[PDB]
Ligand SMILES: Nc1nc2c(ncn2[C@H]2C[C@H](O)[C@@H](COP(=O)(O)OP(=O)(O)OP(=O)(O)O)O2)c(=O)[nH]1
């Protein structure tokens with residue numbers, strides 16, 4: 001993956017980028033537009049990794065700037081608590097039942113032993129899923145690679161970290177394992193992963209480098225929990241990914257510099273895995289025909305409601321993930337009658353949208 | 369008529385005047401069905417019911 005300096009300037013595309021957010025790509029659109037006419041050496045998925053506090057955002061933004069890639073930060077719960085109109089839904093909690101109240105990252109940090117925190121972990125996985133297809137829509141349709149601050153593959157370690165600390169039961173672990181077995185097999189594993197290795201204590205020191213109140217007055221950021229994440233990462237997750245992705249582990253006790261991390265990438269030969277068609281490295285990203293490339297692009301553009309509807313699994317034995325029916329009706333009549341989500345986010349007259357009388361357009365892969 | 373001739377039974381003499389709804393009921397019922405179908409489409413996509421009147425028309 002050539003950087004900005006070896007290329008001699010900004011990256012030029014091999015063909016015209018497809019407007020994937022505006023034009024729907026389907027089977028009948030696959031004849032005129034072909035997927036592999038845009039792919040190059042820069043069209044790879046790079047996922048940066050690491051512990052709780054490792055400077056992933058600034059390093060990933062600098063890696064996106066130097067390699068001419070699209071930056072995708074880690075998804076937080078302000079994507080669904082704050083809708084497209086800017087109204088935060090964390091102010092609806094007096095009217096909501098206590099089993100249906102808002103629960104975000106700071107609510108996990110203040111109250112770790114809450115039931116809905118397990119739901120929160122499951123919710124976070126869905127949000128990571130909700131960006132990963134948005135990663136794979138960007139690589140396949142435009143031909144420019146992406147960088148991800150965290151991965152949907154990188155989220156079961158958080159589940160096991162809550163489970164070994166006692167914040168989750170066996171039932172929520174079994175539920176999240178069933179959703180992971182149901183959903184992760186439809187994704188393509190990333191091309192390259194960068195893990196920023198840190199000790200258990202130094203991350204805590206980096207907590208004091210952040211000075212936010214809800215992460216310093218909390219209880220979860222202890223010696224056993226961060227050691228549990230470090231053990232889970234380096235003993236299960238990275239060893240499972242290194243059979244597919246070229247793993248790069250750096251020590252980040254110091255500040256570090258993104259240029260040497262860029263310069264280690266071009267020393268990797270990515271064409272040595274194409275000699276064997278049954279090689280485990282880059283197995284999900286090789287396609288022998290142009291029609292298989294268009295088949296994957298159709299699966300990742302026209303079948304994103306398919307992959308989001310694969311989460312509809314029934315699990316009723318747990319009492320932490322089952323919403324009460326009276327509480328569900330009260331939640332519906334508060335949440336869907338709130339300003340900003342009475343209708344579909346295009347057609348909402350209460351938030352100043354004009355020209356609704358002649359408008360019949362809807363968003364492609366849009367949450368209703 | 370002292371006999372029931374099938375020719376006289378089947379021949380339309382013209383004494384049966386058609387009703388007021390007879391030429392007009394099927395187009396207005398199919399138009400109401402089309403308007404309700406477009407309303408039902410707009411309701412299932414979480415739009416306002418009378419949002420897209422191009423589809424209604
Ligand atoms: N409960 C829970 N918390 C999570 C999860 N993923 C991230 N967090 C929380 C833990 C910390 O409060 C906070 C740290 O976020 P990250 O580790 O993604 O990095 P951070 O946002 O600090 O960015 P940075 O690495 O500093 O650039 O996010 C998860 O799956 N579950």
Ligand SMILES: CCCCCCCCCCCCCC
Pocket residue numbers: 391392395396399400403
């Ligand atoms: C003989 C001509 C018949 C024309 C069609 C019948 C009248 C239609 C009027 C409008 C019906 C739909 C209203 C919503």
